[PDB]
Amino acid sequence: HGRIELIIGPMFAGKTTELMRRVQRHKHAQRSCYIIKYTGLTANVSVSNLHDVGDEWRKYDVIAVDEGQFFPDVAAFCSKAADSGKVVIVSALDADYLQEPFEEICLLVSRADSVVKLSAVCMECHNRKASFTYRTVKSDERKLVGGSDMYMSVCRSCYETKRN
Amino acid sequence: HGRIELIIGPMFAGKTTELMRRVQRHKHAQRSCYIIKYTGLTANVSVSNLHDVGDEWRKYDVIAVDEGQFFPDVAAFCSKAADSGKVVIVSALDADYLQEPFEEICLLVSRADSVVKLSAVCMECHNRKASFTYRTVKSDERKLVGGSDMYMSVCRSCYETKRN
Amino acid sequence: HGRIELIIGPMFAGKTTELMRRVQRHKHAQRSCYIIKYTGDTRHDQRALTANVSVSNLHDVGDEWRKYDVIAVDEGQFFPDVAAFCSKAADSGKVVIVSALDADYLQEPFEEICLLVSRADSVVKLSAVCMECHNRKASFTYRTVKSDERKLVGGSDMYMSVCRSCYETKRNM
Amino acid sequence: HGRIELIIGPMFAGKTTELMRRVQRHKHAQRSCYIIKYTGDTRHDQRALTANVSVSNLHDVGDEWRKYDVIAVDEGQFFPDVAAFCSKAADSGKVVIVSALDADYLQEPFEEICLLVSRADSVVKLSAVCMECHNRKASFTYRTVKSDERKLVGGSDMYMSVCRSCYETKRNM
Numbered sequence A, B: 001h002g003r004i005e006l007i008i009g010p011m012f013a014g015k016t017t018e019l020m021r022r023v024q025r026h027k028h029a030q031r032s033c034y035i036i037k038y039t040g041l042t043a044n045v046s047v048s049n050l051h052d053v054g055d056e057w058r059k060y061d062v063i064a065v066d067e068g069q070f071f072p073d074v075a076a077f078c079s080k081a082a083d084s085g086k087v088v089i090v091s092a093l094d095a096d097y098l099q100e101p102f103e104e105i106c107l108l109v110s111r112a113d114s115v116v117k118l119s120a121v122c123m124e125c126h127n128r129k130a131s132f133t134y135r136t137v138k139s140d141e142r143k144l145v146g147g148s149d150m151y152m153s154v155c156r157s158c159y160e161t162k163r164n
Numbered sequence C, D: 001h002g003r004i005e006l007i008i009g010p011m012f013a014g015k016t017t018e019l020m021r022r023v024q025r026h027k028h029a030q031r032s033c034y035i036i037k038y039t040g041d042t043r044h045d046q047r048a049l050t051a052n053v054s055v056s057n058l059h060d061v062g063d064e065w066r067k068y069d070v071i072a073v074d075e076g077q078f079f080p081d082v083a084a085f086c087s088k089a090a091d092s093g094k095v096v097i098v099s100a101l102d103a104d105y106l107q108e109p110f111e112e113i114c115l116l117v118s119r120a121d122s123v124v125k126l127s128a129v130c131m132e133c134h135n136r137k138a139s140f141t142y143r144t145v146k147s148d149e150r151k152l153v154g155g156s157d158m159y160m161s162v163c164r165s166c167y168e169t170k171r172n173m
């Protein structure tokens, strides 16, 4: 019946591209896919609690959740949908800019049938796989929406070096 | 220094999306990428022999070749470029519609640092991973350019069943 | 230089075998490899093919780990300080390879292995085959004896790996 | 129902260990597993943990394979009829798992394993660690003794796995 697939890794690793790659595969076989985006055959939605999707997700074979770390109830949602027979596919950061985990994505790891962690390329040294996201601006808000001028994906030693 | 990464699998598996996912990762780290398409920071090209790229590829860190099975000299090209220090990334069909291999992509398998085979979803039964491409029109031309109205990706047993 | 590779999944998924596969690769290239096992864990021991030690926490290895290129930690969920140990060692240039359960018998995470996920360069989650229905990939471990101790050391005499629906079916009974 | 899983890569990459990891998973779910080895291949034998046989070609197994859920073929490149055997068995509903070299010591493909790639549901290529430089992933096998026999049975006494540039450097010498 149902399942949970989780795609994790730092920023700039292509997690969302991989999520969509997987959604597209299902669409070619005539499966209905519902894509849930965050904001503070097919159907799309931008939302801020998974509670706000209501029961719309039940009309679909495949449910995809992007930026899963922004949703506070994501693990319970995914479990409920997978228990109802859906293929659920989630892309999320596993770690925040302090290399500390998103507790809800932890729960997903433990509930997932598959977990892939993608890597990026180090934006500091340009020579190594990157597994970490470095926040290049001062802020102690955990959630801070932004791109390459506020964050960069780095290798282990560039992360240490830049922590000075 | 250099390497060869190969992405194989049947049609509708998202091989090209995965190739581009990888190219994008490199671009975020300021690496130059040259993309070579078939037709009968960045640069694109449509060509029919890899001979026709000349030595343009030497100006790039990363070389990507799409639809590799259409190029008759692809293995030697990839080896030459990887021996010169390039990251080479190739997407190709491993098997033709008769489940017979493309001999040049065989050579690549043996020369590659990494080989991933993606799956599609079965377009006949809609219930299983698909690893094969079934040609739905009569033709005994090996090369026959087309989409879902001429081909479908199928699972092992749907391929047998449809072979009647 | 250094890195953390994590292998997770339920019981019966071959996590230790994958660990030892990776160690052997390094050994062919003449790299020094140290395997750290948990002293309480009782289960051919492939882990006797290089330098190794049995401890109850990682503090008791002392600084012996510094003498190696590669450090492998088996049954990582048993060690209370595993994340920090791994990070210290990977910061000193070691290739650190850890096998661990990500989830306990209640599908609740081991918090220390959660930290490792976030610190790891590589994370693979292996599957088992459902030992109840025999027809599906299994991602969960089901405890088949009555005990509410979170830690309870054992094998197929006390646990089985199951698919998502077999885990539900068996919990309701 | 049936499938073909292929594990390729150079020597010292742990292909047989991965094969036996997969067999063990199936065994925990009580599935019948048969391991077919090559009679000429001399190299703890994990492959003695289920039903097994040593043959020179696959024809000599006869129909014994039909009694199993899972068939594993080790050193597939030695068998002249391996592709057809695998396809026959996978068409009868078996999970067939093959480990093999994809490339010989000259980086030239084993044609029969090429056919398997095209017939396989899953293909993984494992790497080794470069046994010359000790600093890079290795995807090639280098023969360290003089012999132009394509088939020459041996281990680290006759071969080493190497990265792309170490293979060039050593060929020029």
Ligand SMILES: Cc1cn([C@H]2C[C@H](O)[C@@H](CO)O2)c(=O)[nH]c1=O
Residues within 6 Å of the ligand: A011, A067, A093, A095, A096, A097, A098, A133, A142, A143, A144, A145, A146, A147, A151
């Ligand atoms: C690493 C990190 C990223 N982000 C954001 C930046 C982007 O908008 C988004 C990454 O997709 O999440 C945070 O909010 N906090 C963090 O700690």
Ligand SMILES: Cc1cn([C@H]2C[C@H](O)[C@@H](CO)O2)c(=O)[nH]c1=O
Residues within 6 Å of the ligand: B011, B067, B093, B095, B096, B097, B098, B133, B142, B143, B144, B145, B146, B147, B151
């Ligand atoms: C399976 C198969 C696909 N193709 C084509 C169809 C598409 O144009 C392309 C797949 O990208 O290759 C062939 O030319 N021959 C074949 O046997």
Ligand SMILES: Cc1cn([C@H]2C[C@H](O)[C@@H](CO)O2)c(=O)[nH]c1=O
Residues within 6 Å of the ligand: C011, C041, C075, C101, C103, C104, C105, C106, C141, C150, C151, C152, C153, C154, C155, C159
């Ligand atoms: C799933 C699970 C296993 N175990 C034990 C059984 C084994 O000895 C070890 C896993 O190999 O962990 C626990 O102690 N708690 C649990 O929740």
Ligand SMILES: Cc1cn([C@H]2C[C@H](O)[C@@H](CO)O2)c(=O)[nH]c1=O
Residues within 6 Å of the ligand: D011, D041, D075, D101, D103, D104, D105, D106, D141, D150, D151, D152, D153, D154, D155, D159
């Ligand atoms: C690379 C290579 C290995 N071998 C042998 C050595 C081993 O006995 C077996 C690989 O495990 O294959 C060959 O016979 N020819 C070759 O080209």
Ligand SMILES: [Zn+2]
Residues within 6 Å of the ligand: A122, A123, A124, A125, A126, A127, A128, A154, A155, A156, A157, A158, A159
């Ligand atoms: Zn770096």
Ligand SMILES: [Zn+2]
Residues within 6 Å of the ligand: B122, B123, B124, B125, B126, B127, B128, B154, B155, B156, B157, B158, B159
């Ligand atoms: Zn089908």
Ligand SMILES: [Zn+2]
Residues within 6 Å of the ligand: C130, C131, C132, C133, C134, C135, C136, C162, C163, C164, C165, C166, C167
């Ligand atoms: Zn089950």
Ligand SMILES: [Zn+2]
Residues within 6 Å of the ligand: D130, D131, D132, D133, D134, D135, D136, D162, D163, D164, D165, D166, D167
């Ligand atoms: Zn080397």
